[PDB]
Design a protein around this ligand. Structure first.
Ligand code: NI
Ligand SMILES: [Zn+2]
Ligand SMILES: [Zn+2]
Length: 348
């Protein structure tokens, strides 16, 4: 499993900050999800930063902004360097001994959550790609010019990639746009009935639902109720679509409505729940409705943080690396199953 270190560049640590990663010459954070931040504010890391002054954390501008809105990560402020998207950037890896290694890093959009990137590393031990978590539609990788060298893909030694749905059963997942349209039309059909018709979006406590909130808000002229929006203080395109006020027809608040509003003018609110949920169809199956009704007032809506099996295979086929290493072992699969699934798309 992925524990922060790529074989080709062991002195850099990505999305893991404990154990062997405490000796990193440089840190990288692909996105602000708890599963990719293990040890990032551990006392032993703070201890290590105080004895190693030339050690920085690199991330996207949006990841820097989101991380530093948390008081518990503010200690990073002096040591965090943002890298502009698709802007190859020279980084020095200094042995705190005499050793000095130069690497070039390029951030590519991952389509996973605000600030989410893949890291392409170029150095004297080959080119490697760390995808972090990603959802890339067919053809998106082909359009990324900085993955190419003279009209073919770069020679990539190793890809460390998001294998969350790397199982043939998860063959196809409806597109970002198909999922959005389904939720938008369901919400529109409900809240246009009267001012007392309201929707609860039952979402996980994680970044990545903002594009759903912004679209619903833009299209229906309504602000989405959330527990907290201060992390978007300097992100106006997200911020103005959100509200902490309960008096709205679209709620994404978290533990009827979590925020406790049950009526307006003593008229009972007419509430439906919509739970963004991963849905998929098999290789030999047809796409069905992104909206699944689970009760008189309850719905599941297709939504994915991660690429389908067909999207993983298309991406890795295209990259054609020597090696592909799964970042994730799916619950009902084995690492041997995942490694062997991808082996035919690799040069070794
Ligand atoms: Ni994630
Ligand atoms: Zn993750
Ligand atoms: Zn609410």
């Amino acid at each position: 499993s992925f524990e922060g270190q790529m074989a080709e560049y062991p002195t850099i640590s990505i999305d893991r900050f404990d154990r062997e990663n405490l000796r990193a010459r440089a840190y990288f954070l692909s996105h602000c999800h708890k599963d990719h931040m293990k040890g990032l504010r551990a006392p032993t890391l703070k201890r290590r930063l105080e004895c190693s002054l030339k050690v920085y954390l690199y991330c996207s501008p949006v990841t820097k902004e989101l991380l530093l809105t948390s008081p518990k990560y503010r200690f990073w402020k002096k040591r965090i360097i943002s890298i502009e998207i698709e802007t190859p950037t020279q980084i020095s890896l200094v042995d705190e001994s005499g050793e000095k290694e130069e690497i070039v890093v390029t951030l590519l959009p991952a389509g996973h959550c605000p600030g989410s990137v893949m890291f392409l590393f170029q150095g004297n031990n080959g080119t490697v790609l760390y995808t972090g978590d990603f959802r890339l539609a067919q053809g998106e990788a082909a359009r990324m010019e900085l993955l190419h060298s003279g009209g073919r893909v770069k020679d990539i030694q190793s890809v460390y990639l998001d294998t969350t749905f790397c199982d043939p059963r998860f063959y196809q997942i409806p597109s970002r746009e198909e999922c959005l349209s389904g939720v938008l039309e369901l919400v529109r059909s409900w809240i246009t009935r009267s001012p007392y018709h309201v929707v609860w979006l039952n979402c996980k406590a994680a970044y990545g639902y903002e594009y759903l909130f912004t679209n619903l808000s833009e299209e229906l002229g309504v602000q989405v109720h959330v527990n907290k929006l201060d992390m978007f203080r300097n992100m106006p395109e997200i911020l103005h679509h959100l509200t902490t006020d309960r008096n709205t027809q679209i709620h994404a608040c978290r533990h009827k409505l979590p925020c406790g509003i049950t009526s307006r003018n003593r008229i009972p609110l007419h509430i439906i729940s919509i739970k963004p949920s991963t849905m998929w169809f098999g290789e030999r199956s047809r796409k069905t409705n992104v909206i699944v009704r689970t009760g008189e007032s309850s719905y599941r809506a297709c939504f994915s943080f991660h690429s389908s099996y067909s999207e993983i295979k298309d991406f890795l086929s295209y990259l054609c690396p020597v090696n592909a290493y799964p970042n994730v072992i799916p619950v009902g699969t084995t690492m041997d199953k995942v490694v062997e699934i991808l082996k035919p798309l690799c040069r070794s």
